[PDB]
Structure formats: structure tokens, C-alpha cells
Symmetry: D2
């Protein structure tokens, strides 16, 4: 069972993301087996550096919305108040293929 | 250059999705090389059938927002008025790995 | 200083909303002076009854994102795990008028 | 019948908003009777000037999703490719009051 987890940083908070980035990745590390796809959303331009990060997107396995809820609630990014938006959706790969 | 393309169906419009589903997939077919990840969002429960579809999510390569804009504008789903929400974000895979 | 606070219920959770609706309104009651606009989003059709509710939208005064964060975190609806999406934006009335 | 219409500008496109702002307001002018609430979302800080605008939010009367769809499709802002996100929801004022 897969979930899309989309979270967008509040304006002006890039430094909060940076300050908590190592802790965020350490929080994801034990969960890596459950994360199918993951990475930051990016802002203006073509840059792909740390300074270009504007949010977090993951596709993750979970047994329940309760599990997803706790995962989100316990993220260092969430606890730091980084995000202005959070969107979660149950999801599956298209079964033809795209 | 990758973009997240998230689109959520209007309420009560599952039959519109069904009616246009073959055309939508035919529209995606020539673009398949550019689509890294793709599939429907799903609603209540654990079902993964056609009746459980509530929207469309894709991660796709494009050279420009203009290209993404046209791709969205020309989708049979868009032309049928299926969606209540559309969210597009530039994005990259996390470069450690998750 | 005004914020849009948009929150959409998880699929299949209308009964959670109902179960917590009185508590939610009681939670908003002391804050009513700060809420400029408020009401539920509605689903398919033209109905405007309790059964048609699909989420919560408010425009509210706050002195800080920290205040908004706590307001959201302490809502009976949030504690019950009602929502799949939460979007917050600083906002102002257009100064001509619309 | 009321709809929330939420639209967020693409990154780096503040100047597109500025360039099209007069045309946007002229497009809204004949519709003003149908718009209950309207204004720009705002970004970082406490500023409320043109430079602080990051998107458009309206609450508007319409007889149909088809009407909302056309309204969005015909906006100078939409035609200019200003937006990264568009969210539309049927909505009503809470009938106690908040
Ligand atoms: O692969 C898919 C891609 C989509 O966009 C959709 O809506 C449904 C699918 O099965
Ligand atoms: O892999 C990643 C996953 C995230 O959630 C993030 O925010 C940044 C990354 O590089
Ligand atoms: O009133 C307004 C309405 C809008 O849609 C906008 O973008 C800016 C404003 O000032
Ligand atoms: O006024 C209201 C405010 C809310 O947040 C809600 O969910 C329902 C209502 O009727």
C-alpha cells in the first residue's frame, strides 16, 4: 500500500530546512526500505543545489493512514515548523506502464 | 528536468474518468519515455480497481514549464473537465538515496 | 495579519467529522473574533447538509505562523486524524475591491 | 452556490503577475457582484505590497463547475501561464457563525 506525501516549505524558511536537513535524512534512514521515490521539490530556475529546495516529496509504503500520520508528525522538519502545506494520497503505479 | 504533476478529480466525476480513461492512456502512450512514475491516486479503503481512482499523478521529464503547461492543457482528462485541483512542481531525486 | 487555512478530509471519514463536529465548533467558539470567514467545503451535487461536508476552510487573524501552527495542531479534527491535506497561506483582501 | 478558487504563482514569476495585474483586475471588474471575498496570497515577512503577492484567492458565486472552469480558463493570469497550482472547491458559510 503506497502513499504520496507532499510537503511544501513555508516562505522564507529555506534556512530552517538547511538547519534540519541532516536530522531529516537521519529520520528517513531507517525507513529507506519503505520509501520508493523521494526528493525535494525545487524552485525558480534550473539549479538543483541545496539552495533550490522548496519542499519534500516521497512515495512510501505504509499499512495505515495512522502510520502515515505518525511518520509525518515525528519528522524533524514537521517539528521545526518547516511546512505550509501537507498533502497525502493513497496511490498505485499505473498497471499498464507509464 | 523533472516535474511532479498532481491532479485530483472533481467530486462525483468517476464516470467522467472512466469515459475518458482509454483516451487519456492513448494520450500518454507517445510520451511514455518521458514519464518516470505514473498512476492514479486512490480513495477510501484498500481497493485498487478502476472504481477506486480519484486522480492522476505523474513524474515527467520536460524542457520547460511551457511544455508542462501544454501537456496538461491537451490531456483528454483536462478537456473533459475532470479535475478540481492541479499542482505542478519542479523536482529531483534525493541524491543520497531514499 | 490574515491566513487562509484550508483542510480537506481523508476519504471515507465523513463519520469522523460528524463524531467530532460539536467539539470542533466548541474549539472555534472562543476564537470567533479572529475568524473572518469560515465554513465547510462541500462535495458532489447541490446539497448543503452535514452529509455534504468534505473539509474545513477558514480565514483567520493571527500574530504569527507559530500561532497558526498551534491552532491547527490543537483542533479536535486534527487530533482525530480527519485530514488528508492542510494548506496555509498568508493573505490580504484585495485593496480595490472584489 | 459558492466556490473557493485558490491559485498559486509559479516560482520566479512575480513579474508576470505584475505585467498582467491590470488586465486581471479588469477581467474581474464585471464579475465583482459574484465575488464575495478576493485577494492575493502573500509570501515571506509582514509586507502587504505588490511585491509580496504570491497567488490569487477568491470566493465566488457560480451556477456550475462549467462556469468556474471557463472563468479560470479565460483569466489573463491563466493565459499568461502564471500559476503552478489551482484548487477549486464547492463551499458554504458555516451556519452558526465563525
Ligand atoms: O497510469 C496511469 C496514469 C494516469 O495519469 C492515470 O490517471 C491512471 C493510470 O492508471
Ligand atoms: O531525499 C530527500 C527527501 C526529502 O524528504 C527531502 O526533503 C530532501 C531530499 O534530498
Ligand atoms: O483582489 C485581488 C484578486 C486577485 O485574484 C489578485 O490576484 C489580487 C488582488 O488584489
Ligand atoms: O463553520 C464551520 C467551520 C469549520 O472549520 C467546519 O469544518 C464546519 C463549519 O460549519
Amino acid at each position: 500500500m503506497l502513499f504520496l506525501i507532499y510537503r511544501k516549505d513555508r516562505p522564507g524558511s529555506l534556512q530552517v530546512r538547511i538547519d534540519n536537513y541532516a536530522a531529516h535524512l537521519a529520520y528517513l534512514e531507517p525507513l529507506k526500505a519503505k520509501i520508493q521515490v523521494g526528493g525535494p521539490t525545487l524552485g525558480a530556475g534550473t539549479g538543483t543545489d541545496d539552495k533550490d529546495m522548496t519542499g519534500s516529496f516521497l512515495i512510501m509504503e505504509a499499512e495505515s493512514w495512522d502510520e502515515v500520520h505518525s511518520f509525518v508528525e515525528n519528522d524533524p522538519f514537521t517539528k521545526a515548523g518547516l511546512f505550509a502545506a501537507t498533502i497525502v494520497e493513497r496511490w498505485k503505479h499505473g498497471k499498464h506502464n507509464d
